[PDB]
Structures are given as C-alpha cells and as structure tokens.
Amino acid sequence: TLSLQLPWVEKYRPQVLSDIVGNKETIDRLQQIAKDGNMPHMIISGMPGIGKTTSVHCLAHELLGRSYADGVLELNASDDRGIDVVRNQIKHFAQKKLHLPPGKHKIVILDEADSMTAGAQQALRRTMELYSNSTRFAFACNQSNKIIEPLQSRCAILRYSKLSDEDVLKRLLQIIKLEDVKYTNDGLEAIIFTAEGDMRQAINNLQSTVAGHGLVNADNVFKIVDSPHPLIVKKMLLASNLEDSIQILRTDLWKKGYSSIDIVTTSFRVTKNLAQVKESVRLEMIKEIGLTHMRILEGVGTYLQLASMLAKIHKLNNK
Amino acid sequence: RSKENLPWVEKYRPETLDEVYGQNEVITTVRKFVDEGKLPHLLFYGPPGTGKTSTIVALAREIYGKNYSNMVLELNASDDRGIDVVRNQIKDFASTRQIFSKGFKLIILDEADAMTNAAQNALRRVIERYTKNTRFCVLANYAHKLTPALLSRCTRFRFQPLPQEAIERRIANVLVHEKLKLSPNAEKALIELSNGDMRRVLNVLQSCKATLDNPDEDEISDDVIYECCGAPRPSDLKAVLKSILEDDWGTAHYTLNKVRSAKGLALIDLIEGIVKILEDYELQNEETRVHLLTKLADIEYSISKGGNDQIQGSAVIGAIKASFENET
Amino acid sequence: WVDKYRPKSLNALSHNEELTNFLKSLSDQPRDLPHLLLYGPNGTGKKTRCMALLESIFGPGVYRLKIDVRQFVTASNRKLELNVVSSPYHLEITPSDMGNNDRIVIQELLKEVAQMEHRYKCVIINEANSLTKDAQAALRRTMEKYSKNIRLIMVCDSMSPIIAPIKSRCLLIRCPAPSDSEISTILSDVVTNERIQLETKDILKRIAQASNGNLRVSLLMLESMALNNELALKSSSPIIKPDWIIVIHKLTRKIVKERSVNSLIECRAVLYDLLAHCIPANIILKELTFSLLDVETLNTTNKSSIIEYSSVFDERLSLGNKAIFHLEGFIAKVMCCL
Amino acid sequence: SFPEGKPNCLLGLTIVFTGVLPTLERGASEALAKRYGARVTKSISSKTSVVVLGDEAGPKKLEKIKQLKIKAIDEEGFKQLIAGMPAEGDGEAAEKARRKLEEQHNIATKEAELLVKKEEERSKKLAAVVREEDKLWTVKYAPTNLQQVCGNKGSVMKLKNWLANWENSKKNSFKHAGKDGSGVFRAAMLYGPPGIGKTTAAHLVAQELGYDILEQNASDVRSKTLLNAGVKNALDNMSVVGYFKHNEEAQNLNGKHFVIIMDEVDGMSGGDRGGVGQLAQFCRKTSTPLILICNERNLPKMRPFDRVCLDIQFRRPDANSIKSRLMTIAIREKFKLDPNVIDRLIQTTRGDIRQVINLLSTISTTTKTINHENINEISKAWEKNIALKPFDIAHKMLDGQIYSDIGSRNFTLNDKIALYFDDFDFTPLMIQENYLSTRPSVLKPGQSHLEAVAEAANCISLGDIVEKKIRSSEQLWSLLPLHAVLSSVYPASKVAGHMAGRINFTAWLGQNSKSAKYYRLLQEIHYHTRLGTSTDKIGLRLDYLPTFRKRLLDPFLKQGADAISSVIEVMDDYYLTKEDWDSIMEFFVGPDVTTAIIKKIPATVKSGFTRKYN
DNA sequence: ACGCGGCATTCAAGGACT
DNA sequence: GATAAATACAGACCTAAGTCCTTGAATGCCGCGT
DNA sequence: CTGTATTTAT
Numbered sequence A: 001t002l003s004l005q006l007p008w009v010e011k012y013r014p015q016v017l018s019d020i021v022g023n024k025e026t027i028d029r030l031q032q033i034a035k036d037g038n039m040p041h042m043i044i045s046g047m048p049g050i051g052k053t054t055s056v057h058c059l060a061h062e063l064l065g066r067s068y069a070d071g072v073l074e075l076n077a078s079d080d081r082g083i084d085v086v087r088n089q090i091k092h093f094a095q096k097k098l099h100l101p102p103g104k105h106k107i108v109i110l111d112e113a114d115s116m117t118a119g120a121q122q123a124l125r126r127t128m129e130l131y132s133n134s135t136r137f138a139f140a141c142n143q144s145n146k147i148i149e150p151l152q153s154r155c156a157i158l159r160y161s162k163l164s165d166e167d168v169l170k171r172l173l174q175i176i177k178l179e180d181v182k183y184t185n186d187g188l189e190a191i192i193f194t195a196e197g198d199m200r201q202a203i204n205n206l207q208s209t210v211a212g213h214g215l216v217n218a219d220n221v222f223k224i225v226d227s228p229h230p231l232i233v234k235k236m237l238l239a240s241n242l243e244d245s246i247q248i249l250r251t252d253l254w255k256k257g258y259s260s261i262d263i264v265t266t267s268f269r270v271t272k273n274l275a276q277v278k279e280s281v282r283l284e285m286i287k288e289i290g291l292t293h294m295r296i297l298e299g300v301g302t303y304l305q306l307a308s309m310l311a312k313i314h315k316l317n318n319k
Numbered sequence B: 001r002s003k004e005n006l007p008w009v010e011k012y013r014p015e016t017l018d019e020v021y022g023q024n025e026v027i028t029t030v031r032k033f034v035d036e037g038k039l040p041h042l043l044f045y046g047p048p049g050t051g052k053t054s055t056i057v058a059l060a061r062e063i064y065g066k067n068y069s070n071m072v073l074e075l076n077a078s079d080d081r082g083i084d085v086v087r088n089q090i091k092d093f094a095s096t097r098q099i100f101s102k103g104f105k106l107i108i109l110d111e112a113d114a115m116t117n118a119a120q121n122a123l124r125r126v127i128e129r130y131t132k133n134t135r136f137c138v139l140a141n142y143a144h145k146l147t148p149a150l151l152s153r154c155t156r157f158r159f160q161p162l163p164q165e166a167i168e169r170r171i172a173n174v175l176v177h178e179k180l181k182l183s184p185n186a187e188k189a190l191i192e193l194s195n196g197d198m199r200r201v202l203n204v205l206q207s208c209k210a211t212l213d214n215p216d217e218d219e220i221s222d223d224v225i226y227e228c229c230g231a232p233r234p235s236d237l238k239a240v241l242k243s244i245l246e247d248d249w250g251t252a253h254y255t256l257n258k259v260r261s262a263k264g265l266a267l268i269d270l271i272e273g274i275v276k277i278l279e280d281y282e283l284q285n286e287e288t289r290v291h292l293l294t295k296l297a298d299i300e301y302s303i304s305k306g307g308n309d310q311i312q313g314s315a316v317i318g319a320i321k322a323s324f325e326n327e328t
Numbered sequence C: 001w002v003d004k005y006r007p008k009s010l011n012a013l014s015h016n017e018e019l020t021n022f023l024k025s026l027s028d029q030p031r032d033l034p035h036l037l038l039y040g041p042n043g044t045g046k047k048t049r050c051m052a053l054l055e056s057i058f059g060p061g062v063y064r065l066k067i068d069v070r071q072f073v074t075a076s077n078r079k080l081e082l083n084v085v086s087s088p089y090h091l092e093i094t095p096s097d098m099g100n101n102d103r104i105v106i107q108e109l110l111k112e113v114a115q116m117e118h119r120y121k122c123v124i125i126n127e128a129n130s131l132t133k134d135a136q137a138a139l140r141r142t143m144e145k146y147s148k149n150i151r152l153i154m155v156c157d158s159m160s161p162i163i164a165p166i167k168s169r170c171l172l173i174r175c176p177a178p179s180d181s182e183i184s185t186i187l188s189d190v191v192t193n194e195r196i197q198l199e200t201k202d203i204l205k206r207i208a209q210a211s212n213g214n215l216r217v218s219l220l221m222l223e224s225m226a227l228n229n230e231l232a233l234k235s236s237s238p239i240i241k242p243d244w245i246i247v248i249h250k251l252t253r254k255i256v257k258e259r260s261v262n263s264l265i266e267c268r269a270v271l272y273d274l275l276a277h278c279i280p281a282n283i284i285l286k287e288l289t290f291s292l293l294d295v296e297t298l299n300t301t302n303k304s305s306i307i308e309y310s311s312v313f314d315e316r317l318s319l320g321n322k323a324i325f326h327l328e329g330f331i332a333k334v335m336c337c338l
Numbered sequence D: 001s002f003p004e005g006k007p008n009c010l011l012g013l014t015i016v017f018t019g020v021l022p023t024l025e026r027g028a029s030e031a032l033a034k035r036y037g038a039r040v041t042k043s044i045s046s047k048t049s050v051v052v053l054g055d056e057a058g059p060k061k062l063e064k065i066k067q068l069k070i071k072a073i074d075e076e077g078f079k080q081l082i083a084g085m086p087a088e089g090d091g092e093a094a095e096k097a098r099r100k101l102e103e104q105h106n107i108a109t110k111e112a113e114l115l116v117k118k119e120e121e122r123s124k125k126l127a128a129v130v131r132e133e134d135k136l137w138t139v140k141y142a143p144t145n146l147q148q149v150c151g152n153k154g155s156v157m158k159l160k161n162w163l164a165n166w167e168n169s170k171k172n173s174f175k176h177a178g179k180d181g182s183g184v185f186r187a188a189m190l191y192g193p194p195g196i197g198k199t200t201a202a203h204l205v206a207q208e209l210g211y212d213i214l215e216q217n218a219s220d221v222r223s224k225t226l227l228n229a230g231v232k233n234a235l236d237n238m239s240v241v242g243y244f245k246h247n248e249e250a251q252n253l254n255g256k257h258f259v260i261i262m263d264e265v266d267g268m269s270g271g272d273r274g275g276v277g278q279l280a281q282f283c284r285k286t287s288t289p290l291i292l293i294c295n296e297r298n299l300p301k302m303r304p305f306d307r308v309c310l311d312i313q314f315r316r317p318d319a320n321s322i323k324s325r326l327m328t329i330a331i332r333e334k335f336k337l338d339p340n341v342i343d344r345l346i347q348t349t350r351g352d353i354r355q356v357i358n359l360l361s362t363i364s365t366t367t368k369t370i371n372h373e374n375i376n377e378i379s380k381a382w383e384k385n386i387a388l389k390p391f392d393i394a395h396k397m398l399d400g401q402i403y404s405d406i407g408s409r410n411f412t413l414n415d416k417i418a419l420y421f422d423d424f425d426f427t428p429l430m431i432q433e434n435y436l437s438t439r440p441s442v443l444k445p446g447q448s449h450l451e452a453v454a455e456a457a458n459c460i461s462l463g464d465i466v467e468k469k470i471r472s473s474e475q476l477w478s479l480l481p482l483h484a485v486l487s488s489v490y491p492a493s494k495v496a497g498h499m500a501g502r503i504n505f506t507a508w509l510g511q512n513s514k515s516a517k518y519y520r521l522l523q524e525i526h527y528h529t530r531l532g533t534s535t536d537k538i539g540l541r542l543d544y545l546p547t548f549r550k551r552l553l554d555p556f557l558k559q560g561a562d563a564i565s566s567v568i569e570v571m572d573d574y575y576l577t578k579e580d581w582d583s584i585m586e587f588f589v590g591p592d593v594t595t596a597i598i599k600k601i602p603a604t605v606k607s608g609f610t611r612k613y614n
Numbered sequence E: 001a002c003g004c005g006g007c008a009t010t011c012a013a014g015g016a017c018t
Numbered sequence F: 001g002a003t004a005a006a007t008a009c010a011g012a013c014c015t016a017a018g019t020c021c022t023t024g025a026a027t028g029c030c031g032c033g034t
Numbered sequence G: 001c002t003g004t005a006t007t008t009a010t
C-alpha cells in the first residue's frame, strides 16, 4: 500500500501532562511548575520507553502556549554534539529577545543529552548561567553519569524509574478501549511481561499482535514476541543437574538460532546480577563464563564450549 | 551473464516474497503488515544464511515494484557506519520526498551490528522524528552489539535456522532448475551438514555438480556429498568411537589413524561428530559428562590454535577412555 | 676478549665439525640456497657460523659492516628510527629494539630492498623470537614472493615462539652447544695468546662447567677472573658470577627462608629492581626456578610443584604484557607450596 | 518498631552508631537519631556521650571505647532511651544546643526581614527589568557582599589580601613575597568542588576593591588564537569602561585596571597546541591581576600551572554555616524547613550549595513542608553519583564489609563492576599494588593469608592476560567487564579486610618509565658497540657489562689516574663516550652497585679523565 | 591581469572504547 | 594560646595497540575589487 | 588508610 497509518506510539503519544501514567510525584511537580511558571533547569534520566521526552515536550507546550514555535529550540544532542553548536546556535537562541507571558521563559530541549562531547558540555556551563533570566535549559538522557558533574549542579536532578505493570496496563486498556481491539487478560499480562516496563515496547508489541493476528491472546503474543533471552539463560544457569542445563541450551538457545557470543554475554550479565547465589560462587562462574567468552571472541564459537562452560559451572556449584 | 553465470548462492536468491521458505510466521506477518499498511520498524536478527536480506529485498520489490533500487536507501552499515552517515544521508533521505512516485520511504540497514554507538545514538532520534513518512529496517546477526535504545523503537522478528522441510523444498527447486538428481541419503547428509544455512546447501550442491563426471545422467550419492564437503561419514564416526570406547590403545590409535588417512578427514570434525554421538548417549554419572566436555573443549581450542595432530588425537582417545572409565 | 678472538671463516671454526661440514655443503653451490633459521642454545656461536657462511658464499668483505639510520613512520604520525647494520653483500635487521611496530619495519624495508634488485642479498634477522606474530604473518609472503632477490637467514634460540608457517618456509639448522672439552681448548688457546699464566689446566674445565655450554660467557668469565688475579689464574681463583645471578640467588634464599607476605614485600621489591635494570622476565623466571630446584632442603613434592607452577606462569608471562603481574604470582604460589 | 518520642528528645547527645544493627541499617539509624536533634560523628572521642553497638563491633574501636570510658548501649537500649529522654534534650549541653538553635533561627529571621525591606525599597524605586519571582533561587539569593559567603572564610580572606596587596607587590616588582607570602605570585588559582562559590567570591573581591571585572569562559575560548589575541591585548590595557565610568572621583584608583577572572579553566585544550600550556607562559608576564578558576586542579592538562599560580583550595563547606542561609531562604519562600534535615540535604548534595538550593526550589513546588518523613525519598532521588578517585576505589574495593554476606546485598556485584568502571586505567594497578598490604577478614576456615594472596595474584595474572587481549591489535573491548572482575573484584574479595597501613600509589608506572629509559640507554650502548660485539641488546647487559666495568671502572679503583690511557683505549675500541660510560656504570644491581664506588674515586682522577677524553 | 578574502577541504593531535 | 575534637581532603596519572570522533590549525581553491 | 590543613570547641 502506497500510504501508511501512524504508529500507535506516536498517534497516542500524550499531549498533556495528565496522560502520563508513571512517576506520579515527578509528573505532579512538573504540572505545578507548568501552572505556576518559572521552570528550573533539569536533567531527566531513566530507562528507555518510560516517558522522558514526552514529559519535557508536554511541559514545554503547556508552559509556552502558542509560543512553542519560537520559545522552544529542538536539538537532538546526538545529532548536534559539537562545541560549534553551543557557540553559535544555542548562544544566539539564548541572547534572542522574545516577549513571553510573565512566568514563562524560553526552553531548550536537548534530547539524548548523554552523547554530548566534553567540549560542548563544558562550553554550555557559562551559557546556562549567563542567560538564565531568559533561557531555561532542559536535558533528557538515558544515563546521567555521562553528563559532567558541574552541569548536573546547575539543574534539578529529576530521575525516573521503570514503569509499574499497573500503569502500563492502564495505558494499554485506554488505548484498547479507544481503538476497539479484542483482547484477553492473559494476552495483556504477557505483553506487559515482555515489555518489562518499557511502554514503547508494550505499544509496539500490541500493534504487531493486532495487525498480524487480530486477537490479543497469550499464544499469539508469544509467537510474535519471543520470551526474554535473560530468563531462559538464567534458567539454564540455575538448573539443578548438568543434563538439564544441556537440554535447555540445545532446545531453547542453539536450535532456536541464538549465537554463542549472545549466549555468553547474556550469561555473564545474568550471573553478575544474580542474587540467590552467593558472591564467591557467582564470581567463579563469572570466571568460567569469561574464559568461554575469550574463546568465542578468539573464534572458537561452538556448542562444545558452551557445554563445557555449563559443565564447569555445575562442577563449581557441586563442590 | 543472464543470471546464469553466477554462483548458485546468488543465482537462486529469492526475488519475490513467496520464494522465501522456513520463516513462514515472519513472512505472513510482514505480508499482512504491508497489505493493511501498518508496517512498523522492523528488526530481523538471526543466524547467517536465514534469508533476512533476501526477505527484506523481496519486501522492497513487493512494496515499490521493479524500481526498488532507487526509491529505497539501502546502506551497508559495515561499509559506512559513521555518525556523518546519520547526519547527512539517512536524515536527508528521511526528510525529503520521493523523486519517482508518491509513497513512504524505507531505509534498509544491512549488518547494523557493526554501527558505532554514536551512530545508533544519532539514529534513535532520526527514526522517531521522521516516523510519519519513513520506516527503518535493522538487520544484524548479533543483537548484543546493537544499543538497547535501537532495540526499543523497532519491532523484533527472529529468523529461526532453516528447518528440514524448507531446505527440502529449496533443494527440490534447485534440482528442477538444473538437470540433477539427489539420493534421499545424500539429501539427508546435506541437510545435517547444512546447520540451517541454505548458503552451505547451495555451495555443496554446486561443488558436487562440479565433482560429477557427467552431470547429465549420474546421481549425487552420499559418498559424493561427504567427499566433496570433506565431512566424515557417520560409519567412520561410529567405528572410531567404538574403537576408542571398548578396544585397546594400540588398536584405537590404529583405527583413528587409518580413518583419518584413508579419507583425509580432519580431526576437528571427528571431535564434533563424536560429541554429537555421545551427547545422544544416556550416561550413568554426571562426572563423566563433565570430564568429556571439558577435555574435548580444550582439545578443540588447542586445535584452533594448531599444533601436533597425532598428540591431539591421542589426547581425544585418552579423554574419552578416562571419561568412560569413570563409568564403572 | 670475546671479540678479540672470533673465527672469521668456516675453516677457522673448531667445534661441532658436523655443523661446519653442513655449512660448507650449503656453500658449495650458493645459487640454490633455501631460507635459513639458525637455532640453538644462546652463546653457541650461531651468529659466527651465519657470518662465516656469508663469507663463504660472498667474498671476504662481508665483515665490512656499516651502520645506517632509516627513519620509518608508523600507523600514527609518530617517528621511529632503526639502526640497520649493512654490508655490500648483506644487511642485518634486529627488530627486538622496536616494540609492536616490527611489522612495519619488515614490510617496508624488506620489500624496498626487494625492489632494489650473487643475485640475492641475505638479510639476517638476529632476534626472531621477539618478532610479534603479526610481523611473522607479514613476513610469511615476503619470503616466497621475493625469493629471487632476498634470501633470509634467521638467528634464533628457541623455535617455540616462531609460528609454524615461518618454520615450514625455512630450512632448520640445529646448533649444538660446544662441549666442555672444546670450550677448554678454546680457553687454552686464548690464555696462550693473551699470555695468562695458568697454575694448572683444571681452571679452564671449571670455567667451562660454570658456563653451561656458553662460549661467550666462558670467555667473558675468563677475562673477568683474569683481572681479579692480575692475569695469573690460580687453583682457588673464585668463579665470577654476574650481578643478576647473585641477586636471583639471594631471592631464592629469601623465598626458601621467609614464606610470608611481609617477605613478599621485599620479593616484589627485588623483582621491580631487577626489571627496571634491563633484565627480561622470562630469564628471571628460568633462573629463579632452577635455583629454587637446586635447594637441597626442599623435597621432591616441592620441586615438582615448583616446576609445575613455573611452567604455568611461564605460559602466563608469554601471554601477558605486564611481567611482574605473573612473576609475583609465581613467587607467591611457590611460597604457598613451601 | 521504634516507639515515638517527643520532639528533639535526643538533643545535645553525641551518638556514634558503631555496631551493625540487625533491625535498621546504618543510614536508617542515623536518620532516626538526627530526627530528635542528636549529633552523629564518625569518630569515637572523649566528647562522645553514647556509643550504640548491638553486636559486631570493631575490635580496635572497642578498645578505644574502653580507654575513653564511653557508655555503650544496644538496640533495645536505644528504644528505651528514645522514650526516656526529655524534650529538647535540663542538660548543660542540651542548653547549649537550644541556644545555638535559637541564635540560628534569630539570624534567619533577621536576614529574612532585611530581604523583605530590600524588596520593598526595590518596589518603591520601580513605582517612582526581570521580575524577581522569575529568577531562580540560585541567582536571586546570590551573595551580594563577602559577608554572606558560606564556608571557606580563610580562602576568601587570603584572596582578598592577595588582590589588595597586588599593587604593592607590583611596586616591589613581585620579587618580595611579603608577610602573607601572596606577593610573589602574579596569578591566583581557585579550585574546588563545583558549586561552592569560587566565582562568586572572585567577583565580590573584585567588586569590593574597585577593579573592573572582565570575565572570560575558558571552555568557550580555549584555542591559542582567540585567547592569545583577546587576553594579550587585555593584559596591558586600561578599561575604557573604567575611564568613562566616572574617573573624576579619586576614591577608586583601580577603576582603570582589569581583573581577568577566567572561569572554567579546566576546559581548555590540552597539549602544546592547546592553550592550557600557553596560559602558563602567559600569566607570569601580565600587568593586571588574573584569577583562574577550575574544578579539577589535579589534572594532567593543568600540570604547567603549579609553579606559576597561587593555589587556593576551596573546600566543601560544613552544613552548620549553610544552615542559616537555608533557613533564611525557607522563611522567605513560605515553605517549612526543619534544621534537622539540612545536614542530610548537604550530605546528599555533597556540599553543593547551588544544587541544594535547586532541590529546595524544585521540591517546594508540590510539598510545602520538608520534614523527617520524606527526607529519605528526597535523598534517594537527589544523591550525587560522583566517580570515586583512584584512591577511594582502592579503599572501598579493599574492604571487608563490602564483600560480607550482609554487605553483598547492600553493595552488589554490579556496583563493584561500576566502581571499577569509574577508573578503568588505574584500578587494576591500585589493587595489584595494595592487595597484599591489607589484613584479611573474609578468610575461609582453614585458609591463611598467604593462600588468599596467591589466589589473588593468580587472578591478577589472568586479568593481565585479559587486558593484553583487550589492549592489542584485536581490540576486544567487549571483554572489559571480564577484566573488571578478574583484575579488581575477585583478587580483592580473596584478600578483603581492613587496611593495615596506607593506600600507596601504583609503583608500576615509575618503574616502567625507568625500564624504558634504561632500555633506550642500553640500545644506544649496544648500537655503539655493535661493530665490536656480535651480541643482542639483552645479551650485552647480561654478560659484557660486568666485564666492561672491570675494564673501565676497576682500573680507576686500583691503578689510579695512570690507568686513564688504557680506559680511553678500551672506550675507543668500541666507540664509547663519557655518556656511554656513565650509562653502563648505572646498569648494575645488588652487590655490584657503583653509585657509591664512583663517588669514592678522587675528583682529580675524574677531572683528568674528562679533560683527557676531550 | 593581478592580488587579497572569506570559506570549503585536508591535516594532526587528543580522548574513548564498558 | 595551646591542645584537643571533628572533619574535609590529598595522596598520583603510561606507554604501545584499532577505529571512530571532534576540535583547531593549516591548507587549498575561487569570487570580488581595482 | 596515613598525613596535612582548617574551623569550632575546650
């Protein structure tokens, strides 16, 4: 078909701050700031798909009213991460004179701010303070650690958290009711489980299920969206017997098409994040997994090395 | 040329979405997506030779027609993975219209797992901003290399390794296109050595056709497949394993040496086959499996680093014998 | 001096007559000579035999050596300089002086001299073990493609670092170390020519046995004890051991006596002091292990564990840039064994 | 759990929470003690009123308690003491705490009233351009005079004295240091944690003394060309603004001159082409005061600046000084603030006044009363995640509590890996240098210290192998977490415990540089003697050098100054020079060291040798 | 025709890589 | 005024490696004015 | 940790 329909993530992107479901304290604080005015400098950080860009965009829209065209400067940090940007474009926008409602000021939105280079970030330090009376900067990034500490000092540290299953279920139910989709409770629960708090993943998976099969049922959602790799990897690592681990590997990972490097990397990540196993045993399994990773990266990527790694882990656990 | 002077791997590349087999779920899901028009951002991640590139090229043909090479920005991410690419080419293509016909824009990124992290961090906003008139497809053999942000904005489809039936159907189509015949045992051996990759199947079929003295009238037997591929026959594998298991060291060494020398089989393939056979075994105690797997893994790694073939073979014999000696 | 008396021709060689006959057999028809790789114990006389073969093939002017400087550029803009000893008929490359950039020196200089051209020029790679695997991989095709213009002769001590294709492409010439009797004869000739008074001749055999087959070390020790006894060797003349030997011996005594972490303080201190003064770590491990084995107090189990851990940490050293990171581990493991 | 108590019951009591408490972790106990006005210190002292330890107390710390005769109570004792103690701490110390709180509140009210009067005067002047509520709390409460800066009073006084006596030192040509000593340095550097008030202090000292402020952001202007032109023509030029700004009155003679306060000096480009090294040559030849400000003074790029600037270390101000300022800005803004949570706010923010003010502004929009009920959530969401310095990484990684069963839940393995990743170039070296200088406390039953050290060293060997694989032509950077584990975490977990002595810096760096220098010298010597000696680089040092000493140095030891000719002949036989001789004489170790031997040689012999060689 | 004047392009140094 | 509490803070920074990225300096060609 | 520096307290 020549034309396409808009995705549900962008078509149903919240246009007001109330539609945002998660992080109730932060959303209420941003709504109070929007009503009262005098927006402070901030960095918004968290996981992908929990509503950081949407929150800042709704805040800017509501704060600036009809003046969003001029008062808002949109600059994807990854696209424009040079000191030249700060020297010319950001500085000229900050020195720009614009008549606004009393409380409100001009807003700079720098999405994906974690990718800004050191030079541009350091140059922004004085632009943040010199033109603060007229210009207010806003930062959105996946990881706040990439942003230098002095820049974090000048702004409010507003930190987001992974979306709870209840809020994702509420948003999914709202979209389902609005667009008349047939669903089952098991299917919605499975979509929430696969999303793992990423609302964007949940909505994309709902779109895929609806378009492909037409009914939101557990069977369809599992065929169209596979079970999360770390869970099968953890089940393989935490099996009681060696033969069980070998069987889980052969069936779920090797025969299904997962690569050796992916398997070993996910095993390392799961092992480092495991909590039931004591730290010493966890560390020695990490050692064995790292040896297997070294062999795979040197070029020996085979079922034999993965089985040997499982055998070493089981020997380590069996004392 | 006339597409007749090309290797069978490229000669038999699928041209329409109906010539891609094995990935039926992905094929029907994508066909229904394009038919109804809600085509999301696609992520085809799977093992090599599963048809991801062929699937997406057939998608481009079915979406835009015969003139698909000019209305689609197909970029080899391995060749050009810089952030300059995202800033200039990808962004200008997404922003602008089509020079040929009205319609949406599709950008295919092949081997995007080689893209630098800066490039993906730049793309994670280009994809979102231009989603109204542009769609992105990501193909990558490995999903760990790709940034998590790039895995959140694209719908994920997993290309399973090609099963038996799809490989049989493609083998039959290739056999019909040429003037060739395949024995059922030879086809079974080819399927087993394929490991789910049609690339290997086509390469081995072409090599066996070359091996045939007069391909017009003779048949490719299992012997031809094993000889041209170089893989060890199952009979040799069973004989070697039996000789190691329950025979004297001198006889076991003699058997392994004569099996390797007579057919030119490599030792590493023998180890892989022996691992495959002994895995199917039912073992009384756990320790023997652990010892066997560990010692054979170190032997295979040392072979990968090279060394003395006879010493490594004797090490294989000793490891197997000790492991099954633990079963008493 | 060692340099004072060095054979300058094949016919002047006096030890391992089989090797001399093999070299003359190669020199008989020199237009058909494979690439060579001289290997054997250090100090045997492998370089002397290689240069004698060169003198046999070419004229007697191969010993007129001249040092030249050939600046090279690495992948980065850094400037690297090499001293290339050269002769009218041959040139010598010792890539151990450079670090990981020996590959560049190989591929540029050898290809250049190949383009430059008794139709072949022999290149002597004195240090072949320090050649990185990448450098040998680059040299793998240089030997075969330019076999009509350049014929490499390689000097080596242990063939294990050298990769299999390089050994395959080149003829192997074994060099047995001189026997004690031949070392004693050479020392007798030296002391006769140098006018060193000998009270008896058992001194020469003692020096020969204290060199472990090394002739360079034998002559150096001869002259060293010739300076502490006023050019007159006596029966009770002490054997001069180099400084690093004494330091390593004291290290073994400390490891044998104090098996504590507080002793590990000074053990690491001595290892750092030895490493900072141009002493390789593999030599440290070898001498330390063999001196530890010579301790009479330790029983067989300790000796076996020591040699096992020595092999393990030797592998670790061979696969590790930071040497003390493995040397300290070996010493601590030996202390735990004891 | 804990029974409620009437407000400020534990006021005036010094409580140290030494023992690990099963019911509540350290931070929870500290918070529930500070809720009632108690003072928490990290060190047990004579002034410590009560030490709370249920069990698992430090042995040496227990002996300290025993010697200082400090009363000790358990968790149930803390429960009963909460109810037992009366309100407001009565006690003489409690009365002192009462008085301190009353004076702090009184000053808060006085400054609030002063600010209201200032606002009223501004309103009257306007009646007779940015509205005040539009401004952020950081800039609207910025210090207007040097008496409002919180903390670092000594640094402010020293900087003020330096800038005041700058003219006198200029008349003395800067050769004389003066009484304070800040009269020999032309430029001054202010460095410290961000947000403590260096820029404000510099601006205020410039304003008070009457100089004309010229501010340049070094991060914005870092190249040689722009900085060179601008600041050079700024160094020796008067101010047209200063001349036209009412030069007629003679109160301020310094109105003409410039004070160039270069902010963000830490962001200048590095290298010789970079301007950070150019400014070092630049600041010594200037005719106007220079006030450089940077955040990380101990940086490799800032090395040219130690000997050319007056270092001034601004420290993190203590919460007591900022208590009055926070109370004033809380009284003015009609939001309730309890001084008990101010210390926790500063600790969470890590002494950053700007960020604590921003937190107060942002939180107060929704919640009008910041109390002990929501302090935990405020702290957990606003905590600074600052990368630990390579010394604190060594301290924390080499800690017994971190790898304990209880400590593992609090500090997880991923936290340990991130602690490595804070500095991925020095942590493996620091652990290797200080893993065998700690008293272990996680030794397995039947394992001695030496066995743990051997296992740790084996792990560091594997980590070095992994590092070589990562940092070679293959560039396998995906193995970096494996290197983190193998190099830092496992070896430290094997030998985890208490630090016996001090955390030393990695000695591998200096010895490696020394090895490189000695290898260069040996290369030069070997290439000089190449014609004579058929050897390699290593073999020369191994064998010839001992004999070369006997043929060069020993003749000077025994024959005397008459052996000079033979020594010269020996050097000329292998093309050696005096530098070569000196380098060989520095190559011996152990018994054969020549550092003292050459000194004992008569100076006449060495002088004659030098003259004869020349 | 002949000489500067910005502006595009090429070169070189520093930092980072989970 | 000296000596204790009470605490913030500094101890130090390397050489290679491959490839991408950025920033400033040095370089080139091409348009306008006289 | 040890050693040095600064501010409030005795």
Ligand SMILES: Nc1ncnc2c1ncn2[C@@H]1O[C@H](COP(=O)(O)OP(=O)(O)OP(O)(O)=S)[C@@H](O)[C@H]1O
Pocket: B008, B009, B010, B012, B013, B014, B019, B020, B021, B022, B023, B047, B048, B049, B050, B051, B052, B053, B054, B055, B111, B139, B140, B141, B162, B170, B198, B199, B202
């Ligand atoms: N499902 C399939 N049906 C038919 N032919 C196939 C199929 N998969 C692979 N082939 C054959 O194998 C060739 C290679 O296919 P590609 O799609 O290029 O491989 P791939 O799945 O993209 O894996 P790569 O290239 O390593 S990422 C095609 O040209 C076909 O000849």
Ligand SMILES: Nc1ncnc2c1ncn2[C@@H]1O[C@H](COP(=O)(O)OP(=O)(O)OP(O)(O)=S)[C@@H](O)[C@H]1O
Pocket: A150, A153, D137, D138, D139, D141, D142, D143, D148, D149, D150, D151, D193, D194, D195, D196, D197, D198, D199, D200, D201, D264, D294, D295, D317, D325, D353, D354
């Ligand atoms: N000691 C202090 N007392 C009172 N207010 C302060 C203090 N330090 C900082 N502030 C406030 O913080 C604002 C900014 O102070 P700055 O001097 O710019 O911080 P900084 O120390 O220079 O750190 P930077 O700017 O990140 S390098 C001032 O305008 C004050 O409102």
Ligand SMILES: Nc1ncnc2c1ncn2[C@@H]1O[C@H](COP(=O)(O)OP(=O)(O)O)[C@@H](O)[C@H]1O
Pocket: A008, A009, A010, A012, A013, A014, A019, A020, A021, A022, A047, A048, A049, A050, A051, A052, A053, A054, A055, A163, A171, A199, A200
């Ligand atoms: N809390 C939320 N409530 C409702 N929708 C959400 C929420 N978080 C994410 N979404 C949906 O996800 C889509 C994109 O999310 P986005 O805000 O871009 O993620 P990120 O915060 O990582 O940038 C939006 O269209 C929005 O509909």
Ligand SMILES: Nc1ncnc2c1ncn2[C@@H]1O[C@H](COP(=O)(O)OP(=O)(O)O)[C@@H](O)[C@H]1O
Pocket: C001, C002, C003, C004, C005, C006, C007, C012, C013, C014, C015, C041, C042, C043, C044, C045, C046, C047, C048, C049, C186, C215, C216, D534, D535
């Ligand atoms: N056949 C020989 N007869 C006499 N001296 C010899 C002989 N071979 C070697 N040498 C002595 O060995 C010294 C050089 O040893 P060298 O060749 O450098 O050892 P390496 O084998 O380690 O290169 C010479 O000075 C020479 O006197």
Ligand SMILES: [Mg+2]
Pocket: A052, A053, A111, A112, A140
């Ligand atoms: Mg976003």
Ligand SMILES: [Mg+2]
Pocket: B052, B053, B110, B111
């Ligand atoms: Mg492909």
Ligand SMILES: [Mg+2]
Pocket: D198, D199, D263, D264, D293
């Ligand atoms: Mg500042």
